[PDB]
Amino acid sequence: RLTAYERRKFRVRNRIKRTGRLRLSVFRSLKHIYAQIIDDEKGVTLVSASSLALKLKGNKTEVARQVGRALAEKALALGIKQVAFDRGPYKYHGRVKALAEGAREGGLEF
Amino acid sequence: GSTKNGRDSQAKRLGVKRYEGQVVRAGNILVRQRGTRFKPGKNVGMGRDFTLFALVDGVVEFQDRGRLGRYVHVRPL
Amino acid sequence: MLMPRRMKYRKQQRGRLKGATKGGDYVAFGDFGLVALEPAWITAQQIEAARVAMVRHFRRGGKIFIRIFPDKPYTKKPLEVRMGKGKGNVEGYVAVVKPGRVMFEVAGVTEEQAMEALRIAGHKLPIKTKIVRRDAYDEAQ
Amino acid sequence: PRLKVKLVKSPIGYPKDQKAALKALGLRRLQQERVLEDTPAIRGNVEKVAHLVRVEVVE
Amino acid sequence: MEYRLKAYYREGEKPSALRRAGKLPGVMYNRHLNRKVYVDLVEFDKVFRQASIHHVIVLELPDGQSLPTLVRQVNLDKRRRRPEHVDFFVLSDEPVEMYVPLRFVGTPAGVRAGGVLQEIHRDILVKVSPRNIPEFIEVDVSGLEIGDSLHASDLKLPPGVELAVSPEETIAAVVPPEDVEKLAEEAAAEVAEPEVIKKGKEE
RNA sequence: UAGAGCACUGAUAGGGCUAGGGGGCCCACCAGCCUACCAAACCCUGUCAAACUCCGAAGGGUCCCAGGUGGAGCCUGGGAGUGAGGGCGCGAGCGAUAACGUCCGCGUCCGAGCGCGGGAACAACCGAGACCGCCAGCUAAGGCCCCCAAGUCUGGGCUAAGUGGUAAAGGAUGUGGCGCCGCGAAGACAGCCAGGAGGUUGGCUUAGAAGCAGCCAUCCUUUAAAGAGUGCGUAAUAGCUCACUGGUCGAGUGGCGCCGCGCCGAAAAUGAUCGGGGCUCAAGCCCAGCGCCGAAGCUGCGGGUCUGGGGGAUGACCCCA
RNA sequence: UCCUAAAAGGUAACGGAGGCGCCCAAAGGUCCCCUCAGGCGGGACGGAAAUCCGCCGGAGAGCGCAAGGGUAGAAGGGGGC
RNA sequence: UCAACGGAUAAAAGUUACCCCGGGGAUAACAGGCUGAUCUCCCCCGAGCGUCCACAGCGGCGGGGAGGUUUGGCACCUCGAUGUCGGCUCGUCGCAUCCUGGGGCUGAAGAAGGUCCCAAGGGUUGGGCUGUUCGCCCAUUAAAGCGGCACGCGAGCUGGG
RNA sequence: CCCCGUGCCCAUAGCGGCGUGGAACCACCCGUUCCCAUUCCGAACACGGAAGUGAAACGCGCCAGCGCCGAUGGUACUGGGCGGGCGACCGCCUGGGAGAGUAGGUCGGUGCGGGGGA
Ligand SMILES: NC(=[NH2+])NCCC[C@H](N)C(=O)O
Ligand SMILES: [Mg+2]
Ligand SMILES: [Mg+2]
Ligand SMILES: [Mg+2]
Ligand SMILES: [Mg+2]
Ligand SMILES: [Mg+2]
Ligand SMILES: [Mg+2]
Ligand SMILES: [Mg+2]
Ligand SMILES: [Mg+2]
Ligand SMILES: [Mg+2]
Ligand SMILES: [Mg+2]
Ligand SMILES: [Mg+2]
Ligand SMILES: [Mg+2]
Ligand SMILES: [Mg+2]
Ligand SMILES: [Mg+2]
Ligand SMILES: [Mg+2]
Ligand SMILES: [Mg+2]
Ligand SMILES: [Mg+2]
Ligand SMILES: [Mg+2]
Ligand SMILES: [Mg+2]
Ligand SMILES: [Mg+2]
Ligand SMILES: [Mg+2]
Ligand SMILES: [Mg+2]
Ligand SMILES: [Mg+2]
Ligand SMILES: [Mg+2]
Ligand SMILES: [Mg+2]
Ligand SMILES: [Mg+2]
Ligand SMILES: [Mg+2]
Ligand SMILES: [Mg+2]
Ligand SMILES: [Mg+2]
Ligand SMILES: [Mg+2]
Ligand SMILES: [Mg+2]
Ligand SMILES: [Mg+2]
Ligand SMILES: [Mg+2]
Ligand SMILES: [Mg+2]
Ligand SMILES: [Mg+2]
Ligand SMILES: [Mg+2]
Ligand SMILES: [Mg+2]
Ligand SMILES: [Mg+2]
Ligand SMILES: [Mg+2]
Ligand SMILES: [Mg+2]
Ligand SMILES: [Mg+2]
Ligand SMILES: [Mg+2]
Ligand SMILES: [Mg+2]
Ligand SMILES: [Mg+2]
Ligand SMILES: [Mg+2]
Ligand SMILES: [Mg+2]
Ligand SMILES: [Mg+2]
Ligand SMILES: [Mg+2]
Ligand SMILES: [Mg+2]
Ligand SMILES: [Mg+2]
Ligand SMILES: [Mg+2]
Ligand SMILES: [Mg+2]
Ligand SMILES: [Mg+2]
Ligand SMILES: [Mg+2]
Ligand SMILES: [Mg+2]
Ligand SMILES: [Mg+2]
Ligand SMILES: [Mg+2]
Ligand SMILES: [Mg+2]
Ligand SMILES: [Mg+2]
Ligand SMILES: [Mg+2]
Ligand SMILES: [Mg+2]
Ligand SMILES: [Mg+2]
Ligand SMILES: [Mg+2]
Ligand SMILES: [Mg+2]
Ligand SMILES: [Mg+2]
Ligand SMILES: [Mg+2]
Ligand SMILES: [Mg+2]
Ligand SMILES: [Mg+2]
Ligand SMILES: [Mg+2]
Ligand SMILES: [Mg+2]
Ligand SMILES: [Mg+2]
Ligand SMILES: [Mg+2]
Ligand SMILES: [Mg+2]
Ligand SMILES: [Mg+2]
Ligand SMILES: [Mg+2]
Ligand SMILES: [Mg+2]
Ligand SMILES: [Mg+2]
Ligand SMILES: [Mg+2]
Ligand SMILES: [Mg+2]
Ligand SMILES: [Mg+2]
Ligand SMILES: [Mg+2]
Ligand SMILES: [Mg+2]
Ligand SMILES: [Mg+2]
Ligand SMILES: [Mg+2]
Ligand SMILES: [Mg+2]
Ligand SMILES: [Mg+2]
Ligand SMILES: [Mg+2]
Ligand SMILES: [Mg+2]
Ligand SMILES: [Mg+2]
Ligand SMILES: [Mg+2]
Ligand SMILES: [Mg+2]
Ligand SMILES: [Mg+2]
Ligand SMILES: [Mg+2]
Ligand SMILES: [Mg+2]
Ligand SMILES: [Mg+2]
Ligand SMILES: [Mg+2]
Ligand SMILES: [Mg+2]
Ligand SMILES: [Mg+2]
Ligand SMILES: [Mg+2]
Ligand SMILES: [Mg+2]
Ligand SMILES: [Mg+2]
Ligand SMILES: [Mg+2]
Ligand SMILES: [Mg+2]
Ligand SMILES: [Mg+2]
Ligand SMILES: [Mg+2]
Ligand SMILES: [Mg+2]
Ligand SMILES: [Mg+2]
Ligand SMILES: [Mg+2]
Ligand SMILES: [Mg+2]
Ligand SMILES: [Mg+2]
Ligand SMILES: [Mg+2]
Ligand SMILES: [Mg+2]
Ligand SMILES: [Mg+2]
Ligand SMILES: [Mg+2]
Ligand SMILES: [Mg+2]
Ligand SMILES: [Mg+2]
Ligand SMILES: [Mg+2]
Ligand SMILES: [Mg+2]
Ligand SMILES: [Mg+2]
Ligand SMILES: [Mg+2]
Ligand SMILES: [Mg+2]
Ligand SMILES: [Mg+2]
Ligand SMILES: [Mg+2]
Ligand SMILES: [Mg+2]
Ligand SMILES: [Mg+2]
Ligand SMILES: [Mg+2]
Ligand SMILES: [Mg+2]
Ligand SMILES: [Mg+2]
Ligand SMILES: [Mg+2]
Ligand SMILES: [Mg+2]
Ligand SMILES: [Mg+2]
Ligand SMILES: [Mg+2]
Ligand SMILES: [Mg+2]
Ligand SMILES: [Mg+2]
Ligand SMILES: [Mg+2]
Ligand SMILES: [Mg+2]
Ligand SMILES: [Mg+2]
Ligand SMILES: [Mg+2]
Ligand SMILES: [Mg+2]
Ligand SMILES: [Mg+2]
Ligand SMILES: [Mg+2]
Ligand SMILES: [Mg+2]
Ligand SMILES: [Mg+2]
Ligand SMILES: [Mg+2]
Ligand SMILES: [Mg+2]
Ligand SMILES: [Mg+2]
Ligand SMILES: [Mg+2]
Ligand SMILES: [Mg+2]
Ligand SMILES: [Mg+2]
Ligand SMILES: [Mg+2]
Ligand SMILES: [Mg+2]
Ligand SMILES: [Mg+2]
Ligand SMILES: [Mg+2]
Ligand SMILES: [Mg+2]
Ligand SMILES: [Mg+2]
Ligand SMILES: [Mg+2]
Ligand SMILES: [Mg+2]
Ligand SMILES: [Mg+2]
Ligand SMILES: [Mg+2]
Ligand SMILES: [Mg+2]
Ligand SMILES: [Mg+2]
Ligand SMILES: [Mg+2]
Ligand SMILES: [Mg+2]
Ligand SMILES: [Mg+2]
Ligand SMILES: [Mg+2]
Ligand SMILES: [Mg+2]
Ligand SMILES: [Mg+2]
Ligand SMILES: [Mg+2]
Ligand SMILES: [Mg+2]
Ligand SMILES: [Mg+2]
Ligand SMILES: [Mg+2]
Ligand SMILES: [Mg+2]
Ligand SMILES: [Mg+2]
Ligand SMILES: [Mg+2]
Ligand SMILES: [Mg+2]
Ligand SMILES: [Mg+2]
Ligand SMILES: [Mg+2]
Ligand SMILES: [Mg+2]
Ligand SMILES: [Mg+2]
Ligand SMILES: [Mg+2]
Ligand SMILES: [Mg+2]
Ligand SMILES: [Mg+2]
Ligand SMILES: [Mg+2]
Ligand SMILES: [Mg+2]
Ligand SMILES: [Mg+2]
Ligand SMILES: [Mg+2]
Ligand SMILES: [Mg+2]
Ligand SMILES: [Mg+2]
Ligand SMILES: [Mg+2]
Ligand SMILES: [Mg+2]
Ligand SMILES: [Mg+2]
Ligand SMILES: [Mg+2]
Ligand SMILES: [Mg+2]
Ligand SMILES: [Mg+2]
Ligand SMILES: [Mg+2]
Ligand SMILES: [Mg+2]
């Protein structure tokens, strides 16, 4: 038995996979936020960014914007440019939207 | 007496058209089917009648993925 | 007598009759059994005759198990009509019996009663039969 | 190792693929003997008609 | 009691050949071993008609060993009604599931009224240690009528044995007999013609 | 798909459990109690399915690489014929698990091989693809007592029915080979001997039912032994006999099961017949050998023709395939 | 559409069974969200079945309509433009 | 609803025993053939009848065959022709025997029957009705048999159907 | 070695039962001012937080009641080659070889990246 959480996750993620682009996978906990760029052709993660590894302040929104900036900066170093935003079960809004906006501000192409 | 039976439809000539390993070109129809008995894989598109056709030049390969179904891919050349 | 109470299709094709039995080749209820030796379509009339014969020999007492049931519909065209113009009309029902199936079993009766009853029952059948008793080979299946 | 195959029974009345098998081995007339290299393909075609033919192993 | 049987080893000999030589082929196995074997058909028949799968049969192997076994499976030739291959389970010291016979002690009152004691189970499945294999398990059926029934839950089990079926498994009953006086009412009782299941727009 | 299987769609017999009714007590004061009654769902045991499948072969199809030089394949064009098929084998459907029936699939053969050998004779069954010649040789199927070419060939067994040389259910001390049981010199079986008896002319039971007109009964006494009875018998009775024990004879006897070959069941129309004569430790039937005969197949020998390859250079003619 | 059809395709009969000659302006495009039938228990009128709550439930529901295939990791239910 | 759905024209139904030609045994009616559902006959089983008794005489429910005289199925020779019902004449054959002969069982006292077995040598009438075959009827009889031979026989006759 | 993400195998991974984990991570949790939200509901979604709890959910262990997996041997069936029956059908040779059932197995394995630990 699946839950609407997992169903929504599958539903957005398969449509992301079909486009054959690298996926900026987002995960959002109650405290922190994590984001890793994945190539599903090899089952490998290329670049990772998070507020737990960067030790960031309070406001989850500005924190996510900063982790997006960091992810885009570390990604442009490895030749990555175009990507597809894996919003997972999270509606593109608020914290996740700020992460995406920070990623675009760093030069990531999506 | 009489009969109310004798009628049928013209057969539809369905099924697989390019078995695994067969080199194909861009657009070759790979499978004809009602429903998704085979699902599209890498470099394989599907049409409005569930027809799998190659998206690039390459080589057919099948992949049975258990409960996920059966997939047909095109390895580039 | 014996016939299905409902079916998905009224008329069936004739099929084949090759091989030994698919199942029911071992005693599993009574003390004795009547086993078939050659394949045939055994009509419900014949099964009813055999049953009635066995209970008429027992007069009162014993238990009879019928392990075949006629679900194949027999068909026949009307008399003096030519070929074509459809398939015939269902005139009865038969049970596909193949070599080595126990068709009847008798329990709770003397050995002589069971032997003679199974004999008179077999005499109503359109095939050769064999009288069998329950063996440890049956008990192991 | 090579095979010595000899046609001993007539292909008349046998399915056409067995006639084609005879045509691959090079047997056309009865009592004709041929010596073919013992490869799996020639061996398969020889086994296909082994009821019409007599085989002996040589060299 | 305790039965013995002369066994032999077999490797590539075709089974049809052995059976035309009067020998019943089989296999000998447990969670530790597996060997193709064969026995004499007539001697095996003499033994098995008394032992069945209920009593232990020790196999006397040609290398000298004597392995205590249980008949686990026997295939029959459905057309000839004859044993064609035996399965021998080599016993160890741990417990094991098997079938123990049932003796129905007492003559039911239903049988005294004219009915029939239908023995639905002539044995029962039990998980027991090999050193504690009983010969049977008695059952009181003298208080049965037409038509009561006995179940596995009413089985008095000797020490060391445990039931290996659900206690809801019925084991015996007593049914009314066959009666000619019913032939008249059964012959003239009309049976309606079979109703075909509606396909398409009807249901 | 074959097979198999019951998890799905349906069928399905018995049992268990158990909504629902039927019926019976007990009530209209609304519930209760009993079901050898029909019976949903569910479980157990056991099954069935072209239009069911949790399963699932052998095969079949296609692509790749490789063998494969064949009256093979691929491209372009000229010219047709055919578009009534038929028998057989396998897989099915229709039919009646009928038709030298009918309609498909795979194959084959006749068609067009009504050319040849076998099958008595006979398009399609068996053998086998006929270029021409020979008073040569070897085989195929099939045959080797005479017609009629070649064994009255060798070794073992079965059959007595001319079975062989047309058929079924079913029936039988035909006969033979394997096994399985008992009972037997604690004297069996067969015959011949006596005994075969009491409660008891027993009961659910009725108008005769005394062992022997149906059932839901078979219990005891005297016993060496005797069923509250195998059959004949009676309107019932009576009688006779069996199972049964004792005696007499002294070594075998009776009841089952598997396999081989014969017997009956077996009546149709001009004259009979296995093709004929004729065959009985076969000239029949089974198992195993050796030899021979046997075709237009194969070989030897000569020749023609086409195709290819050498000659030679080119239709000059010869050799080889 | 299914069977016959002999596990590639195709395959006949006056063989076995059914349907079509429409419909939808959303029953179409896209983005976002949601998951059934059924069984048990509980609940005014309210019942076998109206709506409510809890637990079990991989799909037996649904997918305009015949049948088959397919299908909730949506092709089903709802909304926005 | 060119639905006869690859759709002869924009536009179309019947009758012929008054009939004709070109063809077909590629296709029916007669007969033969194959088949044997049907039909006729004979067996198997022994529920049950027969006061008593399964089998003198009978045989529920069912089972297996034989014959090729019925009606059919199929469409194989014959449509550049195999005359089709019934009769008359003339026969011949089969035997599942009507009579005559020889038997067994009998619910066979005798006389007379019933049933089955063997037997095809010979025999098996005259008339009323109706085209009839068949069948019914009259008067007899040892008996008034059933079938095959292109439903025997029109280069023998008849010609009522 | 533990935890958090994200794949692959596609139930040997599941149902059920018992036990364990909060330092970290995750979850529930405190709020509903702000963004966003309910065909009603801050349940869900969403935002700001950090008092508490591992009660739920999750992760990690153990158990074979169910579920799932499943040999070997034999058998059915069969491509090819032969016989037998008047037929329904039945055998032999050679190669292939099930399904059911038996023994038994299973309360998952593994890739990549992060946070913590030795
Ligand atoms: N290997 C085979 N394909 N065998 C098939 C057996 C068929 C054969 N006709 C028989 O009855 O036995
Ligand atoms: Mg109609
Ligand atoms: Mg219609
Ligand atoms: Mg049509
Ligand atoms: Mg068609
Ligand atoms: Mg078609
Ligand atoms: Mg079709
Ligand atoms: Mg295909
Ligand atoms: Mg499309
Ligand atoms: Mg579409
Ligand atoms: Mg692969
Ligand atoms: Mg690929
Ligand atoms: Mg058919
Ligand atoms: Mg029938
Ligand atoms: Mg029929
Ligand atoms: Mg019919
Ligand atoms: Mg007609
Ligand atoms: Mg019938
Ligand atoms: Mg019979
Ligand atoms: Mg079974
Ligand atoms: Mg041939
Ligand atoms: Mg072949
Ligand atoms: Mg081939
Ligand atoms: Mg030749
Ligand atoms: Mg040749
Ligand atoms: Mg040779
Ligand atoms: Mg035996
Ligand atoms: Mg409809
Ligand atoms: Mg099948
Ligand atoms: Mg089922
Ligand atoms: Mg089952
Ligand atoms: Mg099918
Ligand atoms: Mg499997
Ligand atoms: Mg394959
Ligand atoms: Mg095919
Ligand atoms: Mg292949
Ligand atoms: Mg091919
Ligand atoms: Mg090549
Ligand atoms: Mg060439
Ligand atoms: Mg050519
Ligand atoms: Mg051309
Ligand atoms: Mg030309
Ligand atoms: Mg033509
Ligand atoms: Mg034409
Ligand atoms: Mg034609
Ligand atoms: Mg044609
Ligand atoms: Mg044809
Ligand atoms: Mg024909
Ligand atoms: Mg043909
Ligand atoms: Mg054959
Ligand atoms: Mg056939
Ligand atoms: Mg018949
Ligand atoms: Mg035929
Ligand atoms: Mg046929
Ligand atoms: Mg024809
Ligand atoms: Mg045709
Ligand atoms: Mg011609
Ligand atoms: Mg030819
Ligand atoms: Mg001529
Ligand atoms: Mg001729
Ligand atoms: Mg000839
Ligand atoms: Mg000849
Ligand atoms: Mg000759
Ligand atoms: Mg010829
Ligand atoms: Mg010679
Ligand atoms: Mg020979
Ligand atoms: Mg001769
Ligand atoms: Mg000879
Ligand atoms: Mg001579
Ligand atoms: Mg001699
Ligand atoms: Mg005689
Ligand atoms: Mg003779
Ligand atoms: Mg004779
Ligand atoms: Mg017999
Ligand atoms: Mg005898
Ligand atoms: Mg005597
Ligand atoms: Mg009395
Ligand atoms: Mg007396
Ligand atoms: Mg005779
Ligand atoms: Mg001799
Ligand atoms: Mg010669
Ligand atoms: Mg020649
Ligand atoms: Mg020459
Ligand atoms: Mg030449
Ligand atoms: Mg098909
Ligand atoms: Mg099909
Ligand atoms: Mg197909
Ligand atoms: Mg195609
Ligand atoms: Mg809308
Ligand atoms: Mg729609
Ligand atoms: Mg609900
Ligand atoms: Mg209420
Ligand atoms: Mg309600
Ligand atoms: Mg559905
Ligand atoms: Mg929508
Ligand atoms: Mg919309
Ligand atoms: Mg706008
Ligand atoms: Mg038209
Ligand atoms: Mg028109
Ligand atoms: Mg068309
Ligand atoms: Mg027009
Ligand atoms: Mg006009
Ligand atoms: Mg008109
Ligand atoms: Mg018109
Ligand atoms: Mg006119
Ligand atoms: Mg006129
Ligand atoms: Mg007129
Ligand atoms: Mg007139
Ligand atoms: Mg006129
Ligand atoms: Mg005139
Ligand atoms: Mg006039
Ligand atoms: Mg005129
Ligand atoms: Mg004319
Ligand atoms: Mg003309
Ligand atoms: Mg004709
Ligand atoms: Mg025509
Ligand atoms: Mg005609
Ligand atoms: Mg005609
Ligand atoms: Mg005619
Ligand atoms: Mg006529
Ligand atoms: Mg005719
Ligand atoms: Mg003629
Ligand atoms: Mg006949
Ligand atoms: Mg008949
Ligand atoms: Mg007879
Ligand atoms: Mg009486
Ligand atoms: Mg009498
Ligand atoms: Mg009587
Ligand atoms: Mg009689
Ligand atoms: Mg019959
Ligand atoms: Mg008859
Ligand atoms: Mg005739
Ligand atoms: Mg005939
Ligand atoms: Mg006639
Ligand atoms: Mg006709
Ligand atoms: Mg005709
Ligand atoms: Mg004709
Ligand atoms: Mg003529
Ligand atoms: Mg004519
Ligand atoms: Mg003429
Ligand atoms: Mg003339
Ligand atoms: Mg006579
Ligand atoms: Mg007389
Ligand atoms: Mg007389
Ligand atoms: Mg007499
Ligand atoms: Mg008298
Ligand atoms: Mg007298
Ligand atoms: Mg008298
Ligand atoms: Mg007699
Ligand atoms: Mg006479
Ligand atoms: Mg006469
Ligand atoms: Mg007269
Ligand atoms: Mg007159
Ligand atoms: Mg007058
Ligand atoms: Mg007159
Ligand atoms: Mg007159
Ligand atoms: Mg008349
Ligand atoms: Mg007189
Ligand atoms: Mg007289
Ligand atoms: Mg006459
Ligand atoms: Mg006639
Ligand atoms: Mg005439
Ligand atoms: Mg006449
Ligand atoms: Mg004439
Ligand atoms: Mg005449
Ligand atoms: Mg004349
Ligand atoms: Mg005339
Ligand atoms: Mg004339
Ligand atoms: Mg006249
Ligand atoms: Mg006239
Ligand atoms: Mg007139
Ligand atoms: Mg008239
Ligand atoms: Mg994880
Ligand atoms: Mg805890
Ligand atoms: Mg904490
Ligand atoms: Mg704490
Ligand atoms: Mg707080
Ligand atoms: Mg507010
Ligand atoms: Mg604020
Ligand atoms: Mg909240
Ligand atoms: Mg939340
Ligand atoms: Mg917890
Ligand atoms: Mg969660
Ligand atoms: Mg936990
Ligand atoms: Mg374990
Ligand atoms: Mg599996
Ligand atoms: Mg298995
Ligand atoms: Mg195996
Ligand atoms: Mg074959
Ligand atoms: Mg076989
Ligand atoms: Mg084999
Ligand atoms: Mg093998
Ligand atoms: Mg298996
Ligand atoms: Mg598990
Ligand atoms: Mg668990
Ligand atoms: Mg990987
Ligand atoms: Mg690490």
CSV table of C-alpha atoms (C1' of nucleotides) and ligand atoms in Angstrom, one decimal, chain H residues 153-156, ligand 166:
chain,number,residue,atom,x,y,z
H,153,C,C1',-38.1,-58.6,-65.6
H,154,G,C1',-41.5,-52.0,-71.1
H,155,A,C1',-35.1,-54.1,-77.9
H,156,G,C1',-41.3,-59.5,-73.4
J,166,MG,MG,-35.8,-56.1,-71.3
